[PDB]
Design a binder for this molecule. Structure first.
Ligand SMILES: Nc1ncnc2c1ncn2[C@@H]1O[C@H](COP(=O)(O)O)[C@@H](O)[C@H]1O
Ligand SMILES: Nc1ncnc2c1ncn2[C@@H]1O[C@H](COP(=O)(O)O)[C@@H](O)[C@H]1O
Ligand SMILES: Nc1ncnc2c1ncn2[C@@H]1O[C@H](COP(=O)(O)O)[C@@H](O)[C@H]1O
Ligand code: NA
Ligand code: NA
Ligand code: NA
Lengths: 109, 334, 334, 109, 109, 334
């Protein structure tokens, strides 16, 4: 049970490739993204398809980082670069990674 | 003279026809609630395979024809698409409570073209028996790409001299991102398959029969997508309602006469002039607002989406497709 | 007399026809596993654009006809839809182990009408060359709305006098929530576009050709959606299997003869009587169980969904559409 | 890193607008809903569409509240009102909201 | 607020029925699965449908267990059996289940 | 002799036709970016209702025909599907840097067939006016199921004697899981509805008209799904590029002549020999993958998916469907 930090970024859908570049360049081992819907008083959501078929219009990243200082390095290069003009929220939870290869190493957790 | 006569009997016959009847039929039910929704997987294969038909019928009638005739209308659209955003930079932006960054993004969307307002014209041109030029569907990328790129450049050359001088845009990844997007790479595929191959056994049989049928499903989406943004331009100032209600009429007149130079210089179709007008008078709202949000992030999306969906596209189809068919039916043959 | 003769040769010819062949074909494969699934985006655009056809063919033949003839069949369905839930309140609920709240919700769905069992009748009426009345498709909202609203009111007037008297329903938001739902606002749009506009170039060409084809995809879904609930009414008592197997036969006989008053009083089609029967015998299972779960939350959903999907809809199509076509083909012309 | 509480409500799909009214009236700054599937021994799921195309038949709200007493105010007006007749589960996790405007304020987190 | 442990398994999509058998046999009261997308340097994802329409190609289980030793019993019968040949990551978060019937009991939480 | 003459003028006419034009048209746009995507709900109802047509046209021409003629071609495919995986076990696996577990899984997919590569042959056989046997579409089950099951058994009998002897497969749940999967239970439904019922009013009208049209949408997906794996077999050794480029040519020659025993023994169609060759020269890439990953988990999925999608299916349609039509058009009638 290697202790980790679950960074969660919940932003607009059109930032799918752009924040995934920030995650890959920061040195995180990977991410998990899913399509969500929400309500946050900045609700416009261009998104590419028409509005009435936008049952889900946000995306939710979940990045498990080994150290706290990497999770606030990812979260800072997003909120400076995109959240002054786009929607979003970022929060850190705690987690203990039990299994996995790129996060434990060959020795295990 | 004979133009108010052949508008009012043409506006009614437009409104009886299903390419406008489902648009106002889609706004009426969406104003009343209606948890009816057309899903995103159906709306994608209807915007594809409606622009593949426009591509295939343009690519077939571009290989057996001398492509000298195309030189004036594909240059009169590059000029015109750049012209629209400068009209909004010197008319719309000079009102008391309006931002220049929003007014360039509103005129950026009107400069573009939308395949919904376009394919509605290609049926109505051959419903009233007006022989239009078949490659005029391939005129879609011009006055879509130079209009969105001259709204991002001009908004940055405004926003640079506000913080650098008062208190750089890479020109290629704007136009190689809008080019290989959906609803444009569907048509460029349809062009290249018409120039090079012979898809005449699948065009007449799949793409031509259910073209006017799938257009009616697509016009129903655009009506519901117009009522969903009608409460959004009540968040910005009242001059966007004036702009989006007059600019389809103004941009098409300086598209009609600017396209009346054709079939006086090189032989053009005169049913292609009204196609070149409806493409200038229509504003983009599916492929457009992905750009001008990654390109112009400091703009208000409630100001340019709410003007080209709610008021831009119903007026470009309701009072603008019969406005230019009848004017072409008066001035010449129909 | 001649009725068992013209049933058994009509039940076989129904079972050869693809509007029942894919239903039992869909139950057979779903009983054997089959990770085949028809996705939700396809099932939505098939329930739409099958009820738009029913709406458009009803709206076209309602503007050029005197609408005095409609007065008896649209009043004989409002009476009948309220009648079904009271039959279940005095027959089904009076069994030893059955709750009154469930039996009102089971009879609430059988009063209502599903478009699957309905559009299966509209093809089979014009497959056996029986001229049915075209606006009878517009009789769908009546005996759908008064049947679901007289199961929510009656279940609350039972449940009030059990805890207030022994140990208030707002009548409009029940019927303005079922009205602007999907599969009903698809048809009311199809009605209003047929009365007012002229969509005859998109009806014959998109909505009429692939109507009998998309019905077969939709009958395949309803067979797989019948086997998925066949293990659900083995959770409630055995009298629901008896009710759901006999009540399509009983509710249609007191729909046929109650609709035999028509074409004796005002001129009715006699192929519209069998349409009025198959609509009375069919039970809702797509638009129905959203309501009677927000309206009657204390009911058991395994008791009323498991009866109108698993046994209600295959019997309403298998042994009930040929039961009333042949009875109308015996008693009169066919 | 303003400390918050992630309220998670996992209920049937037909309560999408009804619980979103409860969240908006309680004074929460917003929610995040997504379509999930599950298994909980109350599995019927009317849901509006036919059963075989119900790959996902639940919904999952995630509400970040500033105080614990608001998250149990939202969770109480749902379980009294709907969970006596509908399916559901509610749980609170802990989180530190890093960025966002309606949750931090103009001063930031 | 009965204290629980949120076990999260994020694996390939084709293990939907196979891990749901492991969850049901272990004695957990239920699970919550959703379709996600991701990136983890073992990205192939056969998945049954063609590749270009694989916007989401992973699945994400969330199992709330009453005790820690059940959550590591579920997580061990997956990583031994599937993660030597398939993709995946498993982690435990903490949660306090407020409401629910199969997890609280008739006495409540 | 006359075979290079009637290939090179047949390869061009194949490449002009939309059943290959959209495949290379789909690879060209996907090489250039194109955020165009055909969604999963559309791709499922196109693989269904293309194999339902193949099932219905096979089931109709299997009830009015003596089924003695079927005995040789349905036995020449069971033999051949087992034969392909042993060819890969003694040719592909015996290269310097290649694993036996991967080479059995690559030959396991080439053994199996692909509805996309088979639907492309059934149109091209009746585009060049070659009367093929109609039940040859019902030959999809055979040489799909014995080829995938003799790659899982043989890979385990290799992997047992590596750790048990050097350092048990339940035969039924392999073939009752691939049988009730999608794209095969779509066709077995289409067979049983053709043998037993009479769906001739829905076949001609829904399943036959938009067959060649939906095939072109499906060929566009397979081109984009070929470029998405072209960077995946640059992760494994270079002998997979050699295998996947030659084995469609080799496996069809020992399918043609092995099927030339038919119409010398029992009366076979000779346009069914070329159908039996393409069904033998094609790979899985959609149904094959799910298996051989639950059955052979220790294999490299980049080695067998990257060979049957990127190089297997474009060569089986580009240079293999005209290779065997012209060879059947030379050797006999066409
Ligand atoms: N307090 C909150 N709890 C959960 N999600 C939130 C909260 N505030 C904002 N969000 C989500 O953050 C995204 C952007 O919201 P905003 O930027 O505040 O408009 C949307 O997906 C919201 O649902
Ligand atoms: N222990 C649990 N862990 C995760 N999800 C659960 C649990 N119990 C119930 N659920 C979810 O709660 C919803 C309702 O379940 P129930 O009300 O118990 O039938 C379903 O989406 C279940 O998947
Ligand atoms: N550090 C991480 N944070 C979040 N998700 C991850 C992480 N590592 C792997 N995953 C997810 O785990 C799944 C399998 O990744 P892998 O097995 O590492 O290829 C994918 O859905 C990834 O998105
Ligand atoms: Na324009
Ligand atoms: Na009824
Ligand atoms: Na093969």
């Amino acid at each position: 049970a290697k202790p980790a930090n679950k960074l969660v970024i919940v932003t607009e859908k059109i930032l799918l490739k752009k924040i995934a570049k920030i995650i890959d360049e920061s040195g995180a081992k990977g991410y998990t993204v899913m399509n969500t819907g929400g309500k946050g008083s900045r609700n416009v959501r261009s998104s590419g398809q028409p509005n009435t078929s936008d049952i889900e219009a946000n995306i939710k990243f979940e990045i498990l980082t080994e150290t706290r200082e990497m999770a606030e390095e990812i979260a800072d290069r997003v909120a400076v670069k995109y959240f002054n003009d786009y929607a979003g929220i970022i929060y850190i939870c705690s987690a203990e990674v039990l299994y996995g290869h790129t996060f434990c190493g060959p020795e295990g957790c | 003279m004979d133009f108010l006569s052949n508008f009012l009997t043409d506006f009614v016959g437009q409104l009886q026809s299903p390419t406008l009847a489902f648009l106002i039929g889609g706004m009426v039910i969406a104003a009343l609630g209606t948890q009816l929704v057309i899903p995103e997987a159906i709306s994608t294969i209807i915007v594809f395979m409606l622009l593949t038909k426009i591509g295939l019928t343009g690519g077939m009638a571009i290989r057996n024809s001398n492509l000298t005739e195309m030189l004036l209308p594909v240059a009169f659209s590059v000029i015109l698409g750049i012209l629209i955003v400068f009209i909004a930079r010197f008319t719309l932006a000079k009102l008391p409570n309006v931002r220049t960054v929003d007014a360039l993004a509103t005129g950026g969307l009107f400069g573009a073209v939308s395949g919904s307002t376009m394919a509605a014209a290609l049926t109505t041109l051959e419903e009233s028996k007006i022989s239009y030029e078949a490659w005029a569907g391939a005129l879609y990328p011009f006055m879509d790409i130079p209009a969105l790129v001259t709204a991002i450049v001009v908004a940055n050359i405004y926003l640079n001299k506000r913080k650098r001088k008062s208190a750089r845009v890479k020109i290629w990844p704007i136009i190689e991102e809008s080019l290989q997007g959906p609803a444009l790479s569907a048509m460029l595929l349809g062009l290249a398959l018409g120039i090079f191959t012979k898809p005449e056994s699948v065009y007449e049989g799949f793409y031509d029969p259910l073209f006017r049928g799938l257009l009616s499903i697509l016009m129903l989406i655009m009506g519901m997508e117009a009522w969903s943004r009608i409460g959004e331009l009540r968040k910005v100032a009242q001059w966007y309602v004036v702009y989006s209600l007059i600019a389809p009429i103004v941009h098409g007149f300086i598209a009609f006469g600017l396209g009346m130079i054709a079939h006086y210089a090189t032989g053009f179709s005169l049913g292609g002039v009204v196609v070149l007008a409806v493409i200038a008078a229509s504003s983009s709202d599916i492929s457009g607002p992905p750009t001008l949000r990654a390109g112009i992030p400091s703009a208000n999306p409630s100001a340019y989406i709410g003007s080209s969906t709610a008021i831009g596209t119903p007026i470009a189809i309701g009072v603008c497709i019969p406005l230019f068919i009848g004017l072409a039916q008066t001035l010449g043959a129909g």
